[PDB]
């Protein structure tokens, strides 16, 4: 692909394939030319080395990339390792409908509630708001709804307050040591930029309010909402799965 300014970025597989093709063509040319056997043997050894470096690089001499010293990245290096497909993309995807911010105290909340800023809620729930706006007749076409949301009119806030009503969200802290690092709450729209976390769940989360951050996800499908409300809800997880002792002790 091209980059801004006419510079190109490419993958090492192109270099490895080009080397293999060049050596193969030269071997064909030599064979068609009846060269002395020593040259032919040298060419055959070179082609062996090129193909072996293409398949799994680093088992003989680790051919290094041109205009650089780093060894090239072969086919087998993409599958394996902590940065391969299996562990980097096939088990650890990134997802849509999510954000993060800093967490605050909010001691007035109930055990099943969390404070969610208006801006984050609007950005996370846009499509639901478009649907509601079109359904109610306020916006004739989806482009009209998009413009209305961008302009931030009062009806937009009313529709958001209506669509955020009984829709739970998931909150997650960075090191997820056990299953209580994910729980579902019912958002309460607030003004500001930091999330509000009930004091009683801090022990389970292992959270302190000196700079910690949290992530928020939105369950889309209807079965996902039912699972969030009936399995992960914050008022369902009171006992430790490791031992039956409570985990909502006042700290």
């Amino acid at each position: 692909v091209p980059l801004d300014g006419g510079r190109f970025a490419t993958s090492d597989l192109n270099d490895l394939y080009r080397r293999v093709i060049n050596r193969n063509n030269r071997l064909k040319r030599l064979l068609d030319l009846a060269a002395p056997d020593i040259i032919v043997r040298n060419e055959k050894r070179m082609l062996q080395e090129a193909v072996d470096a293409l398949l799994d690089n680093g088992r003989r001499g680790r051919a290094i990339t041109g205009s650089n010293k780093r060894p090239l990245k072969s086919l087998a290096d993409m599958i394996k390792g902590k940065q391969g497909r299996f562990r980097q993309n096939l088990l650890g995807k990134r997802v849509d409908y999510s954000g993060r911010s800093v967490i605050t105290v909010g001691p007035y909340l109930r055990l099943h509630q969390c404070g969610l800023p208006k801006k984050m809620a609007l950005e996370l729930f846009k499509p639901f708001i478009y649907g509601k706006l079109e359904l109610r007749g306020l916006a004739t076409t989806i482009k009209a709804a998009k413009k209305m949301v961008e302009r931030e009119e009062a009806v937009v806030w009313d529709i958001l307050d209506e669509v955020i009503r009984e829709h739970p969200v998931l909150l997650n802290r960075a090191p997820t040591l056990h299953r209580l690092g994910i729980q579902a709450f019912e958002p309460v729209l607030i003004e500001g930029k930091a999330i509000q976390l009930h004091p009683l769940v801090c022990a389970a989360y292992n959270a302190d309010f000196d700079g910690d951050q949290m992530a928020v996800h939105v369950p889309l499908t209807l079965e996902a909402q039912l699972e969030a409300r009936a399995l992960m809800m914050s008022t369902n997880n009171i006992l430790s799965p490791a031992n039956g002792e409570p985990i909502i002790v006042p700290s």
Binding site: N42, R45, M46, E49, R60, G61
Partner: peptide, 13 residues
Amino acid sequence: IGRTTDPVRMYMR
């Protein structure tokens, strides 16, 4: 011989 792996040394030999 020392069982070298470098094709350059072999060709030189």
